[model samples]
Target: STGSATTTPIDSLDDAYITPVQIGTPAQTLNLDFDTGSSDLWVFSSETTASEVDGQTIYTPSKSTTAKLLSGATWSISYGDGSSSSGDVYTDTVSVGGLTVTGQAVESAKKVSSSFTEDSTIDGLLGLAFSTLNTVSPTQQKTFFDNAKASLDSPVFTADLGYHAPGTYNFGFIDTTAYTGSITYTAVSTKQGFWEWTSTGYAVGSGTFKSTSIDGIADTGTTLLYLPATVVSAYWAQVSGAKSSSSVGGYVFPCSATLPSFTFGVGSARIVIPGDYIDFGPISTGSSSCFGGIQSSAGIGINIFGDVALKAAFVVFNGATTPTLGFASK
Candidate 1:
């Protein structure tokens, strides 16, 4: 079976993308962040503390006749940014786009961090990463994609993220019309339970291509592209009045500065990120200082090709015995 879903950015800066997912018997539709960086289909629900419940939608398992508790099952996950959530587990009928999965584990948040509570845009997170990364103890639950893969026409999914526009996530079949040129495939290492791959090289704007293997994961959950300090510095140096600022929390520059495009290689395929995409957005409302879409990955431990980079191309996550990632220009 094949399925398709439309994902749209929550904010003008394209901070994160949210997709509507249907859960339970009556089909409670909730906007969830389809995150590829982690494995845990957790939701803000009735079990969540009242204080933590802001304007977000909560999934009520009791209201769903199809919902069944996973006895003694619980989950806890802490993100790199210190945000976290813990919850009870339930198996229910879950559907995304047109694909349905019966008995898909749906975690119901009992506790959440301030960061999550403040984000009124998302009701929960639907993980697309490998199940091996699942935080559920005793019996780690499979991700929604994993459970749906068997029924999928092809054990693969494609991400077509857009800049300031609605994007698409297609399962089972690749949309040939969505991209230009042939798809360039590359080996993927799931040793870390991520869609991790090595980029061929990188080029800043009209500069020479730097022949280096940049290892990173294709993380839709992340908002910015993070690379080695060496690569990051090269890009920022070209921008006049650009500097890493502690006050601003990243490299910021004059909003009026003409930013250069960033290009990365997937095999011989060059996916060029438009200059406007790199000029993330102003640091504050009506502020002249802007934050860059590209940042240093030195502190993060691993380079991350986040939405900022993924938006530049068509990405295919092929779930084979030896998983391979495919990239193509849109």
Candidate 2:
């Protein structure tokens, strides 16, 4: 999606983990996925079978005069969704957002079978989320931001996730003009993959969900806002006519009802999710319902403040040092 303001088109690659750069005298381009969850940028090659190519975008080395294959190196990646792909390694120039990194490592998959092919809007995922999840060998951990860090004018990348809007996801240098006052900076922690921090607590409208205050991990890779059971239920209770809907596996409230303004305490800063975002999507049983961003997961492993909540704020995953994961706003 295009940014509201006229900004430079940030260069993006096909792969989710690695950004692509153009190479050769004429500048041949290869879209790479820079995934923080997984390392290694693998693209579909012309050598792949026709059936495998179905619904998939392939990179033709012949089309690029500079493409070079890493003959002996083979690569593979498995996701939490139980899907996987394997291929041979290659070296080429990768470009994104008008910047180019030369001789970057990438993978050319001879085979591919994954839901990623179904995503029509994205040729590949450029994972700029974190480093611990990288799957490449020697743990070189080349994230899009890692390679582009030097090129970034602000040294920070922000993801404006748009779940309801047509152009929800935005990348590139952080835009601080739209925000009020100075941005708050959250310290980074070594244990978390992407500069994770504790969520001091959460509140809905005038109602405080957690009296004791709970901590949560911020994740852009995740799409939903998972909260502890008590917190989810407490926040939902504040909705004027909120009701439990088992059909959708979450709470369903009056779409027209004024949603209570919710705020997440991040240390000393208070990040709030606008009311309009609260009732995003259709809410009817059989009909499409606006997904109530918050969900109950009391017994669940960890509370994840996913992209649903993160889009409201500017975030940064600091990999400048080892054990990287940091957050900030613009």
Q: What does the lDDT read for residue 119 in candidate 1? A: 97
Top-scoring candidate (TM-score): 1
RMSD of 2: 5.6
Model 1: CA > 4 A from native: none
In angstroms, how far off is 219's CA in candidate 1? 0.2
The local distance difference test score of model 1 is 0.94
RMSD of 1: 0.8
Taking all chains together, the TM-score of candidate 1 against the true structure is 0.99
The C-alpha stretches of model 2 lying farther than 4 A from their native spots are 1-56, 80-86, 109-114, 137-141, 150-155, 162-175, 209-215, 240-258, 283-290, 297-300, 322-330
Tell me the tens digit of each residue's lDDT in model 2 across 36-63.
Answer: 3444566666766566565545666666
How do the predictions measure up, each by TM-score? 0.99, 0.73
Q: What are the lDDT figures for the candidates, one per model?
A: 0.94, 0.55
